[PDB]
Design goal:
The structure is a homotetramer of 494-residue chains. Chain A is of the alpha/beta class and 494 residues long. The first copy, chain A, folds into two domains: 1-264 and 455-494, no CATH class; 265-454, no CATH class. Chain A has helices at 50-63, 69-72, 75-91, 93-104, 108-129, 165-178, 193-205, 219-228, 241-253, 277-289, 306-320, 341-356, 388-391, 407-415, 430-439, 472-476; strands spanning 16-18, 21-23, 30-34, 41-46, 135-138, 144-152, 155-159, 182-186, 212-214, 234-238, 258-262, 268-271, 301-305, 360-363, 367-368, 374-375, 378-381, 398-404, 422-426, 444-447, 466-467, 480-488. A seven-stranded mixed β-sheet of chain A has the order 14-17-18-13-12-19-20, sandwiched between helices. A six-stranded mixed β-sheet of chain A has the order 9-8-7-10-11-21, sandwiched between helices. Chains A and B meet through β6, α9, β11, α15 and β20 of A and β6, α9, β11, α15 and β20 of B. The complex binds the ligand C[C@@H](Sc1nc2c(cnn2C)c(=O)n1-c1ccc(CO)cc1)c1ccccc1 (2 copies), chloride ion (CL) (4 copies) and ytterbium (III) ion (YB) (4 copies). One chloride ion sits between chains C (458, 472-474) and D (135-136, 148, 482). Chains A, B, C, D: It holds the Pfam family Aldedh. Chains A, B, C, D: The active site is at 262. Chains A, B, C, D: GO terms for molecular function: aldehyde dehydrogenase (NAD+) activity. Chains A, B, C, D: It comes from Homo sapiens.
Chain lengths: 494, 494, 494, 494
Amino acid sequence: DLPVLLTDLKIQYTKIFINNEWHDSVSGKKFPVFNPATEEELCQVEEGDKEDVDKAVKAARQAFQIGSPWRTMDASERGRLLYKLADLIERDRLLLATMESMNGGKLYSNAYLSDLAGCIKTLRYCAGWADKIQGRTIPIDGNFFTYTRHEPIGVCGQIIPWNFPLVMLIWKIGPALSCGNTVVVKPAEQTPLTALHVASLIKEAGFPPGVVNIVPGYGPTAGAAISSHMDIDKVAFTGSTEVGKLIKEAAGKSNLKRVTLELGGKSPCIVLADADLDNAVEFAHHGVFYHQGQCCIAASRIFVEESIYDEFVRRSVERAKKYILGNPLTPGVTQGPQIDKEQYDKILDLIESGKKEGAKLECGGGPWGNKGYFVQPTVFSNVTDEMRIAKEEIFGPVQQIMKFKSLDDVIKRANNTFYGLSAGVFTKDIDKAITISSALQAGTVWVNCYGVVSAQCPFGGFKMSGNGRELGEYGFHEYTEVKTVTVKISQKNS
Amino acid sequence: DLPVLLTDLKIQYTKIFINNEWHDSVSGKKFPVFNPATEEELCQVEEGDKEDVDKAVKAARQAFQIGSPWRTMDASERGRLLYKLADLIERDRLLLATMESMNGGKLYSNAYLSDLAGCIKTLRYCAGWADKIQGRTIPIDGNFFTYTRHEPIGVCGQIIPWNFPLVMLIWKIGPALSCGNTVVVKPAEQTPLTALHVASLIKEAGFPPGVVNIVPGYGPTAGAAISSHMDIDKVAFTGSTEVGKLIKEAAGKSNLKRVTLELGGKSPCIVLADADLDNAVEFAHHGVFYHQGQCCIAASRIFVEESIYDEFVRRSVERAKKYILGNPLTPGVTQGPQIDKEQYDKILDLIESGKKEGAKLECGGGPWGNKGYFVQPTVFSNVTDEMRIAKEEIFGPVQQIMKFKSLDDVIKRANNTFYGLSAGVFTKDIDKAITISSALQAGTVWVNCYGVVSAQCPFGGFKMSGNGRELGEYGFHEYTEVKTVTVKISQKNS
Amino acid sequence: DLPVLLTDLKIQYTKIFINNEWHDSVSGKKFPVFNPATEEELCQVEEGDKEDVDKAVKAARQAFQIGSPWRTMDASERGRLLYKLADLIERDRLLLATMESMNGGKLYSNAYLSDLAGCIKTLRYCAGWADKIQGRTIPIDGNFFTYTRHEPIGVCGQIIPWNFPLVMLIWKIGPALSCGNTVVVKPAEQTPLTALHVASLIKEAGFPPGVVNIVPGYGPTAGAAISSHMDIDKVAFTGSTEVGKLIKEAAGKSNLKRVTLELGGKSPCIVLADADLDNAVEFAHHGVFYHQGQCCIAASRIFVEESIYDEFVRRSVERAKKYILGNPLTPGVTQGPQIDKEQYDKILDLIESGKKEGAKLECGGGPWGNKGYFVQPTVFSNVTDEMRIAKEEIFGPVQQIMKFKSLDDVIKRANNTFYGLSAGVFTKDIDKAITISSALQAGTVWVNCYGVVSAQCPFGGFKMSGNGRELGEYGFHEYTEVKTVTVKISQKNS
Amino acid sequence: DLPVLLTDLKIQYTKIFINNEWHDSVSGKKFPVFNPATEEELCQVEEGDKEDVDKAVKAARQAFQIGSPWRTMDASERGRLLYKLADLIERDRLLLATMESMNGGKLYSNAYLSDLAGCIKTLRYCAGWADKIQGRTIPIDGNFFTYTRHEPIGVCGQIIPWNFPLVMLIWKIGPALSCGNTVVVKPAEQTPLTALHVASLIKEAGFPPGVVNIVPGYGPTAGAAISSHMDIDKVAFTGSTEVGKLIKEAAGKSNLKRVTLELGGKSPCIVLADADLDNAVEFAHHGVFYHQGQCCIAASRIFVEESIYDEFVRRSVERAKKYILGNPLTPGVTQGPQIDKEQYDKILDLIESGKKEGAKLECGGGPWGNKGYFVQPTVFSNVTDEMRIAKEEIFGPVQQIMKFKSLDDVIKRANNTFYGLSAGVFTKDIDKAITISSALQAGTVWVNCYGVVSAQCPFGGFKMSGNGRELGEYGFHEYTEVKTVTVKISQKNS
Ligand SMILES: C[C@@H](Sc1nc2c(cnn2C)c(=O)n1-c1ccc(CO)cc1)c1ccccc1
Ligand SMILES: C[C@@H](Sc1nc2c(cnn2C)c(=O)n1-c1ccc(CO)cc1)c1ccccc1
Ligand SMILES: [Cl-]
Ligand SMILES: [Cl-]
Ligand SMILES: [Cl-]
Ligand SMILES: [Cl-]
Ligand SMILES: [Yb+3]
Ligand SMILES: [Yb+3]
Ligand SMILES: [Yb+3]
Ligand SMILES: [Yb+3]
């Protein structure tokens, strides 16, 4: 069931959100927000800079003070607020999915059925953790009573990318709020709008003022202000590995703020000769092509055993030739645009290297349309490891298919990258599934599937694909700070 | 019972330890090691530089490869090796404590009774965790079987300070080895010797080659090589907050390696009017004066309620006047030297600011002896918050005593620092003990005691006193990397 | 804010609830349900017997089969159903509290403000656990992959008492359903009605049929059928220790079904001379007198240090003389009736022993009113340990106050009972609070309070006050059955 | 490497062990201990009865008192004592294995290489848990500080079977002691001797007196005394399901003591057509024939798919015909005797039913030798579900092989038993391995193996095969009793 919005969407929220009120920028500047499918300006939004991030941090700090409503409320009540926010996002599902589709260049069916469903489910999952974050009592040596408090860390700076704006917003704020933190969020310059609507719902839900502050604007200004701030306790960032390195460096230089990073990948799939071939083709296909290839987990190197390689390439190419490009809001359209010019250019430039460096172009490999940042869905076979398209994250609808005959060697090739976000293994063999997934240097390893994400699992990168994990039980640890309290007593008993 | 070594100690191990064999430096240079009590050269040690760290990382990487003895052995057997290492350290307790005392300027009674006891106990504690590191099975949405592996991270670079060389060595290698990591250790330039003896015991215990590699040398060369290395997966560092910032920055610039930091402090004690006064004086005293003040947790700001302040200062001063300075090896001696000239100078310079900025000198405040980096035990009363001695870590035998009358205000003053390693609260009031310890922004809060450390507790800093925790159950998480494995199935059942 | 129902309550649901449909009894018999305040018949309800429990178990077994909707739905969806049930109970709060008050003899202010609030909050807490129940991956010796599944146990028989009918219903079904079990509930013969309304809401919420089955009737028939059934996997019971022993015996005789028991108590309070006296009097008062003394945790032995004993008794007696007896539905009424004749008789008989055995009657000690099972609120001082009123659970509004001078001896006296549900300690001394609470053989120990219950804490008895725990993280374990899966592999890696 | 004892074994310890001293029985009676291979009397042992169990419980109770050495020692020191006991068992490995072989009828190679290795490893595993048993700090509603203590339960009565006397002794005492309990152990009447030697080593290791008490004797006297004792807090029993029911009943009747049971089985294997046939034959073979079939996990129903059934039966029969019967002490001997006459008779009687009820006798099916309780290794093919040999636990060297063609139906047949200790699944199919192991109602499910037991895994039965789990992290919970401590505070902060 794919319902739709009956009136044309109006944009309402375009201001900086601090202490549950709407602020003009300190400078008074505003910046335009575009639709990637039409190249048309949707609206303008208040440009947050260092001066605005400073207001936002001061409000977050005040909301975190000992004795404040947010610090003193029952953990169960933090949970209640989060489940209420999920109910409000569910109420505004049509509006939010439409705004998400229009601003993000994101197919509406997927926006409504997947992105919004995941947002609501992740929030409800995090709500449930709030009053289940626990420390320990510890049988220390000597006559002492020792316990630990898993406290909130404090003011968390949270920088969100443009590829899944709502999902990424909730992946940040859900766990941070569940644990009792206050946040300063910087949504992507390309996609501020859905986050500003969520801010209106945070107010409506009744979160105390200053617990969530949202400062739209650019990365090199508002994002740098966050990463270098002397009174932000933690920065969480999802985006490029390049910017990830700047974030971690700036945290080091400033106040040694805690860092988690969810970065890019060059994620490999290994398809064994005994694999269910159609299943492997279908998952590897969606694994690389989902949301116009703009996923950090993009299955951008597919190694297939030689005896099934030709059949794999043939079936993959036929699947890639089935797309219908267009405005992501029109029903039946199955591929929207890339987010912007910068990305569009990078994608086309990398497509040209595949041709020049000698990969076999099976289909696509150029642009589409008179308007909008559209790239034809592209497949390269006979890709080799030193090619640019095998080493660099494309972040576009461009599939690479490689051959292998040695399992020892293809695991080395899979692991021979600075990335390590995820990987896929396709086989019917129990031993192969376990041993290969153990040997892959990847944060998530899918077996006979790909791109299966859920709130109950931790998610994050090995190596330069990330630091730390988001979601699951394990992800909640990185939004707590552990305090040991050791009390002298006359005599302990076990 | 304080037994002693019957023969004069000979130094045997002075070389770089890689793949369980002793190496000369690549350059061929060596550097001198001194006794801080006599200023005399004890020996020379091979100077590890970038070229040597490179050999050490290659060996650690090879020992970590899938299919290696260290990766394939039973977790229970990693545990067994660690308990064997503890038995060997216990066997060599006299030798190790003597070498630790002589090289570190550390009182021998404390070296033997505390440092070595803590080393052995921490190793035995970590051994027990080895086969109890577990992932999860997770009821993900959809028809999937999801589990997680809490894998070792990989090659861990571990930089150790000079103040507790053996304890800090074991705090690093115990958890890292228990979890299945391989390590490259850089002991302090001042104190390489006890670590090199432990390396001989790692060989004797039967650890596979390359699992522990020890590279002595300087910080700006060997330490920088570690922090900037493109194939070290994690750096752990204990030391100054200043160097901590360089470590985190370099990790960011290079390969986004995981970082934990245990840094300095300016740790406060709050002594309420209802406190057991003698107990508060005794613990605050040892809290600041332990190991010539060379503890990151040094209780270097003692806030005392006004009505008991005079009596507190009087009793504290009398306790500080009871010390006997000398060579840390002579029985009855109760205060050894500072580690080196750099520290000695910093301590005296800060003592001079206390005088100049207007603190009341109660006792001490100059050097002692014709040889050795000795500082008289010093007490300042009427210290105020803007003084250098109230803001900067002294790392010397220098106590600061402050007065307060308002509990709200003294908690602000306690928290008004970029540090946050630890704190002390002294009171008989149940409510005060709980509420004050909750409000303090400190990693460990002691109630009616100070400096109670044990292997079962997590330990680390809030704010610029650290990132992450060492020891306890919680500390073991930062030596694992979490992998989610998600397997497609026909139908799941709860 | 105490709102009320605008129309007089009508009873609608009076039938046995199996497979989400309403059933007449197999025999066709019905049994009367009374109001304890008027002694008047409210209605008749279908009498479940062994033959009906058999239908209910068959439905629960079918709902638990591998491949069923309840076994195959997402854990997150079990959670969703539970949060929906909580929303429906919140919607029907006025109706449920009124029915609870009228059928249970329970003061309406408390029914509405506490019982219903606790029901809703406990359900919401349990909902949050559903998709957070996890097994482990385990580094077993040898070349194996080992994981565990924390499965639901299966069909759980759940026997509920009359004193907190709704709260006890939700304490049973919340965790059992969160974990994926199916249930056969036997509410108390005195109080079937609110549970049958909840059954209508379980249907409305959309729980699959057979997941919850409710069989009203008597204990020696329907309760015995449950405890002795060959295809019930687990029995959970709250009630008398006497019946608890019959339940455990019958489980042993039949099919070794798993057992948890929440039984009675003779819970002690220790009031030290340094205690906040008014706080200790107020909490000890409500600790014994709550819900006409019909709490398993009733603070039915209050030991007070001699120097404050007289003042404690005086203040307690004045507090007990402030009650207004009457129909629990009338505003301003502060004490309702006992549940029934059996209990009423037992209470009066025990009150007579206090007089005869030589306790000092301070106030009360007889019945009240022309109708309804009312007992005057009673206080005995100078109670000694061999008295019946100091050994036996009264379950009525009858307080016992004792004196002590030796802390060693009063802890022995506190622990000198076969019971062990809970206890209270009142002191300002940190050491006393910790050491006394450690030494008490009680499941919950309150310090400077009493009767503080919350969903986040485990709750249950030491000794003959119970087996196992309900609620908290820990309580959820007893609604899972652990399966270890060990898979042969060619080679494991850490 | 199978070394042996150089002198003939002498029996030294034959007395009741209470408070670390050797006691004659209260009656003064003694009972004979036999070698099952020769039918010859080895010695006499003091017969413990109710009067002796009473002495043992009083000593255990005193060792558990608040303030005792066992309650006040560091958890790390409980661990140390356990690792010391493991070292002493390792020292006496030859003596213990020989005594175990001679008294238990247990093949010496297995006694030395498996039983003693498992004893030592399990103890070392449990030692590591001692100072890692932790409670929680819990964010309860309202202004309270809540924590939990995972205390030892108290005096644990532990009844051990004859089939693995040392392993079962350590499986009981290891976790119970690690958690801080005191124990009264009743080893099997057939096999008291190795436990009494371990008692001498508990004394030598330096356990405080009364922490471990061992009372040899019979089950219907000493075992009943334990199960019905009013001051034993918990009973743990491994043995027959029949006696298991008596234990649970008696706990119910007496003092509602906590119960865990590890009972018998009729454990099934499902061998799919795609299985590695030789691996399935080898593991199913050892799965049923290990230790003369005297394992609770005996793979006593092997369901094989029809197309490989004939080949499976043929290969299995050839493997069963390779045994060499004799005294378990002679090298090359590969099958020892049954434990005693009672078991021997039961085995032969059940073998006769297989013949009479129409199973196909492939080999064996009678006794062997002039002396010793020897049974020929027996294989029945064409077994059907209503046969006695398919329903009843034989506990002898008797294999049952069945055919199936429907996977749905063979899972029903596998699950169609009151037992549920363990099961085996043999297949190369990933989906089959996961789905079948999920659907089996068995505590341990092995995939492509059988009888893989390790200290790191929990172990126990579904249904009438047991209550609770032993070993792993999960097993340690059943040796703790949880206390919630809830402290009133002025104001909480997260
Ligand atoms: C919307 C999905 S997330 C999701 N779904 C995908 C990707 C590629 N194909 N599909 C179907 C995909 O890349 N994601 C995804 C988005 C963000 C992050 C972390 O930054 C990780 C993954 C979700 C969110 C929340 C709960 C459940 C599912
Ligand atoms: C030797 C101690 S550690 C110890 N003891 C002290 C300090 C000041 N006074 N005392 C008595 C003190 O500062 N330490 C200490 C040393 C290192 C670290 C982490 O880098 C933390 C603390 C120990 C080690 C291991 C187990 C138990 C105790
Ligand atoms: Cl912790
Ligand atoms: Cl995890
Ligand atoms: Cl488990
Ligand atoms: Cl708990
Ligand atoms: Yb264009
Ligand atoms: Yb000098
Ligand atoms: Yb009457
Ligand atoms: Yb015979």
